Design a binder for this molecule. Structure first.
Ligand SMILES: Cc1cc2nc3c(=O)[nH]c(=O)nc-3n(C[C@H](O)[C@H](O)[C@H](O)COP(=O)(O)OP(=O)(O)OC[C@H]3O[C@@H](n4cnc5c(N)ncnc54)[C@H](O)[C@@H]3O)c2cc1C
Ligand SMILES: Cc1cc2nc3c(=O)[nH]c(=O)nc-3n(C[C@H](O)[C@H](O)[C@H](O)COP(=O)(O)OP(=O)(O)OC[C@H]3O[C@@H](n4cnc5c(N)ncnc54)[C@H](O)[C@@H]3O)c2cc1C
Ligand SMILES: Cc1cc2nc3c(=O)[nH]c(=O)nc-3n(C[C@H](O)[C@H](O)[C@H](O)COP(=O)(O)OP(=O)(O)OC[C@H]3O[C@@H](n4cnc5c(N)ncnc54)[C@H](O)[C@@H]3O)c2cc1C
Lengths: 394, 394, 394, 394
């Protein structure tokens, strides 16, 4: 009733997000003790609806590791996407051009899959914990937390992996002198709505117009997920279903294509930045996923990045826990950040190409249209774009 | 007034640069009399030594028109180039990737050939003229000039072609209300030197380093042409052959590749900006070449753009003087500017990828290395680059 | 690395222009360590022949700061100007309309005063330095420079202020992503001559004619300062003194007014554009004067703007160094940019009203004359013009 | 060939529009016979809905000439206006600044007044006539026309005056060699709507915003007239009343100011350009009103200019027909065109200050706000604006 209980694990994992839970499960199947603490309820996580686009590799990781094959049953495979600009829609054919596809499967469903998998396998994931602090980072680290029932624990592990997300608490514990932050902020955001309607397109539509950028994308057959470019500080309450659909028509509708429209069942404005914390390992803290980086949503590279991170980190942990090798853990930061910059650059290129530069810089708008034309008009261009989108298989 | 002699031509051409002379010669070979006025001496023009990289199409135009095949004899065909960064040199194999090559031939040599060809055919080309004005652009145009020996003349033409280059006089005579000017100015320039030594590589090497960008390019076997990135207002006299070679060393040298060095025989600071005047026809003035647009030198598209300009303009002029159709003349601006923005986009991409972002932009520089990696690492990437470099063949 | 002598000050000043030197003297008189570095010799600066038109307030700053009262002795106070169009000259009476005057006094004399004053008091002004570099701007800044005798120094300051002029080195060192450049380029320039002759009128004459614009201005009693509108790349080499005086005659003379004339003792062609770099503070580098903006000469607002910048910046610096308050520095860009755009708008209006629209816009010329009549015909109009001319007294 | 009945007048007036009828009545009360031919039915003319902004002078001409004093009772006098930009509304106080007002009184009401006045006083206004031809203009002119009932007439008079409006037939009969035309077209138009609602402001609100320009105007107390800036080719059909009012809120609403609204009862888009036909007298045909010029709606200066034209035309006719002097008739064109150019410039300046320049010229937008600030903050500026707005009292 006053005991701060000591409990032991091999890996302390902070975050019941996709990256944390995926790492938890791979550690489980390689036989390494992991305890995962999260500050939100399972329900909070499941009611937070982020759409998702999974690269070939992320879908393979979910599957070949046994986490959950429901992605293959309930998530739709797409062989391409379309760029809409100047009234024309062009098709980037992933399969014809690079022979890979992507799978559209909501990220919350990945969460549900992974959390259920861990529970069914009796994994140790504590939700709704509080008073979270981290200690002895370069030693044998220790995590202080008060679990959901009010009980206090000191968890002691060999390493901590902080998968706290972009509001990371673990990464706030690193001394500034031993880290470096890379930032780049944008003057626009996405206004994202979930609306009840049939497919207005089969594939994703990225569209660029004088009035802004807009993405026509799908989540359910009943509900579709749509985004359009907006001011960073817009209040959804000052928005009518009519006004939302008007913005969408002005950017997408016309020239022999009409956008199906429905009731606006949720709306939310979603800001974003490029962020990179390097190196991704400090002492025995490893950072993974959005705790360590973030990207503009355009590329769909975020959750792919996180899953990738946990995979490379896990390979390091297994090498170490099987043979005592430190070579892979030391190479974790290099391997991860390498991909992180590739993704940063690609998501940046996509953002630049598709969003109309806020405020009408005319040479800028001209150059942007020039680029869009060259990309859709060159087979090498479409192939390079598809390679980046579908996960750089090579 | 005293008499300024009144003379007629069908096309009065302002500028004895390569675009002006090439149009003059093409109008000649189709039997259309064109008179060329220039404000510099033939000698002034020839002492300006700018290197040149000619796309296949430019070489075909120079040859199949009879202008000069000396491009084939004295100019070297290159089949690729190299992007150097982080000590490694990667090679874009143009012929392997897109099946085109390019020809390295000094731009002043092209001027020499074309000027000689005009003289040899008796073409009217008057150098060192002054008092140059342009009048009645929407009427039957008129060019006033005071030729070399002091005679004042009024030339009357059916059309004026302004090929004045970036110090163009003609584009200033087009009313501001009826045109649009497009800008983008860079925070660096090029320091260009000619030094006597053999080629330190076979092909051109574009290198990007912490200290800046540098281009290793060839002019003679005796003389090599080098450039390195510099501040827009750098003064060449505050630099020694030693200091210049230092900048080149710190940017290019390393990892088993050494830069040969020689006596520094010329040094000059060479500014540049991206500019586009649209539309490229006003009344009966047609603008071409640096009169209507300019590029960063990185992409090598400037003289190529000029030749493309004059080629499309000649086809319009021929259509009209043979069959009276204005369709080709009316579509000149569209055709020309379509290609011009293509080049604008590509030259911007090359520039931003290789020049080091001034000021310790950390995200900027990190993403730059990411992009350079994605491009040299992907065959589609190198293919897209090669396609554009060589002139968008297919 | 041979130790570069390291020296510290509180404010590093880049530029020995009037704005820079005046900043130095204001910092000195409030007792703040200010060190000024320059790349030109004092004699080179002095051979720079620029006339000047001082707003009332600028003359007040020159005196009430102790910089130099020589302005009042050797520079003459003017109570108005005359607008010449349609062969008629109308007079704007500054004192009658807004009750302020302006003081015509060569800008080089202001440089002389400020150079002499800093030198005669403790002089921290280093001429003819080279190897100018800027570092760690968002931190505690550093300036590297190689002074005139070859000494290398690393200077460390709390703030850097860029008064480099339009050939600024500082504005090229601020990351492109954190700045914006504003442009507007004109289709004309000024051909400026200094000629020995008596004053042809009382005040400056702004004259507008079918043949172009011309400004008759005063510098000495012996020498008058004259400008006429010309093509941006006009070369004086192709110009005789007779032809110059013909241009002035066709632009100004008539209806019983003839311009007195003399030997053309200097001639030079003078380019200009409207340019604005915002924000005017990045980190602890502050930009001022032609380093941060430029305007067309028609309105006479350039050096006035520079001095205004330095005054507001000095006030921020003093507030901070006296109470540790940052507020005045933080709003520096705001105040400066407000006044700067006001000057920008005024100078654009003056230029657009007075120069003859290149290319025979008939509607443009008619609208121009309509405006000029409506302006000189309305008392409110002349008062608005005078208010802006004299510096917005109120 | 059938004989056309021969009829006599002194002044042939073509157009029973405001200017034609006003000339008719001035001629009547001065005892000069006026005969008026019109191509529309009386109901046709009266159904034309132009809002109206009458200068001081138009109100004086309407009242003191006896046309109809109904304007003072039934037209509302406005003593200022409000410039809304950057969410701020500044007020131009016409009465405070120049001591004149303007009267908002629909132009349709002025037509009714003038038509009723001519009919009751004995007047020749022949509506719904056709088969218009005009002959022997530089002599004693002759006009052929067919009234609505089929009667054929040749009317023969001393002078013809054309008030046909901007689709004028008379100005198309003038030899191009004997005239000059001035044109200039703008890239936008006005979206004008008539909607039932109470006053959202007392005075007119001109508002300038990112999303466009918008004018809040009155016709009734019951019905309001509104405009917003849009593409010259936009169809009211593809518009919902909800969508329209959205455009208006995005342009005007904010900072605690909301636009009252009701359902939209008429909508129509209004193209506009600047035009001037000179000289306005060719032979013994005189031109007035929109037959001879056109303006941007921004100033409301069209009907005012027309009335001024007819006033000077009548005064010329009076000098000649009473004392036989041609001095007033010969100089009519000069005076009319002088004021016309004044109004052209004023309408131009208002538009450039208020319309957001389509396509994002960034320096342009900055200069625009600079102008707006300098004008609203200066008493001379607001006074000059008010002077021109209210009619150039003097
Ligand atoms: C196609 C596609 C589209 C995308 N669109 C968007 C978009 O529109 N907007 C956007 O912002 N991102 C977007 N992303 C990125 C995606 O939303 C992120 O990956 C997401 O935040 C999940 O994070 P993670 O598991 O990948 O990284 P992790 O670092 O594992 O983050 C998991 C999430 O769990 C939460 N969490 C974990 N541990 C804790 C803890 N201890 N305390 C509190 N919270 C915790 C975090 O808030 C975090 O967001 C997109 C990605 C893809 C592939
Ligand atoms: C460092 C550098 C590297 C480059 N590398 C390449 C490369 O690899 N490939 C490539 O294709 N290009 C290259 N360029 C060329 C560059 O892109 C230029 O834009 C290109 O040369 C086009 O200019 P021009 O000589 O055709 O001028 P033009 O448009 O062809 O005409 C210029 C001529 O006009 C004359 N003229 C000026 N004013 C008047 C007047 N009033 N009346 C009459 N005549 C007048 C001038 O005297 C001059 O001779 C390079 C340039 C530089 C500086
Ligand atoms: C009525 C009127 C008329 C005007 N007419 C003109 C006109 O005709 N032409 C014109 O150009 N301006 C004109 N001006 C504007 C005036 O020249 C500028 O506003 C003024 O130069 C701004 O002050 P500054 O100190 O930035 O100028 P500057 O004189 O440019 O001072 C900057 C100094 O910094 C030095 N410097 C440059 N680079 C470096 C470096 N890297 N390190 C160290 N020092 C460096 C330069 O040598 C220079 O001496 C006019 C202004 C007014 C009010």
């Amino acid at each position: 009733m006053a005991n701060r209980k000591v409990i032991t694990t091999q890996v302390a994992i902070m975050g019941a997000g996709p990256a944390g839970l995926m790492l938890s499960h791979l550690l489980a199947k390689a036989g390494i003790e992991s305890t995962v603490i999260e500050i939100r309820s399972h329900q909070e996580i499941s009611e937070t609806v982020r759409a998702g686009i999974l690269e070939h590799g992320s879908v393979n990781l979910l599957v070949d590791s046994g986490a959950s094959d429901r992605v293959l049953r309930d998530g739709d495979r797409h062989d391409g996407i379309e760029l809409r600009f100047n009234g024309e829609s062009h098709r980037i054919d992933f399969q014809d051009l690079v022979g890979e596809s992507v799978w559209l499967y909501p990220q919350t469903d990945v969460f549900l899959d992974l959390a259920a998998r861990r529970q069914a396998d009796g994994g140790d994931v504590r939700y709704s914990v509080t008073d979270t602090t981290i200690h002895d980072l370069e030693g044998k680290p220790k995590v202080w937390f008060t679990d959901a029932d009010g009980v206090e624990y000191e968890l002691q592990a060999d390493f901590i992996a902080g998968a706290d997300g972009s509001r990371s608490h673990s990464r706030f514990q690193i001394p500034e002198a031993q880290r470096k932050w890379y930032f780049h902020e944008y003057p626009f955001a996405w206004f994202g709505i979930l609306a009840e309607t049939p497919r207005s397109s089969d594939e994703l539509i990225y569209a660029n117009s004088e009035n802004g950028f807009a993405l026509i994308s799908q989540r359910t057959e009943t509900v579709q997920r749509l985004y359009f470019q907006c001011d960073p500080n817009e209040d959804v309450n000052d928005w009518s279903d009519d006004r939302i659909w008007d913005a969408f028509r002005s950017r997408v509708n016309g020239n022999g294509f009409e956008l199906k429209e429905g009731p606006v069942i949720d709306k939310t404005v979603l800001k974003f930045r490029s962020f990179v914390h390097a190196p991704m390992r400090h002492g025995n803290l490893f950072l993974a996923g959005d705790a360590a980086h973030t990207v503009p949503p355009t590329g769909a590279k975020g959750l792919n990045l996180a899953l990738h991170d946990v995979k490379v980190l896990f390979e390091g942990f297994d090498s170490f826990y099987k043979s005592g090798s430190t070579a892979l853990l030391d190479g974790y930061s290099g391997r991860a950040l390498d991909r992180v910059w590739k993704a940063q650059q690609f998501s940046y290129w996509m953002t630049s190409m598709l969003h109309t530069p806020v405020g009408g810089d005319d040479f800028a708008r001209a150059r942007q249209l020039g680029e869009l034309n060259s990309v859709v008009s060159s087979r090498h261009g479409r192939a390079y774009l598809a390679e980046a989108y579908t996960g750089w298989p090579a």
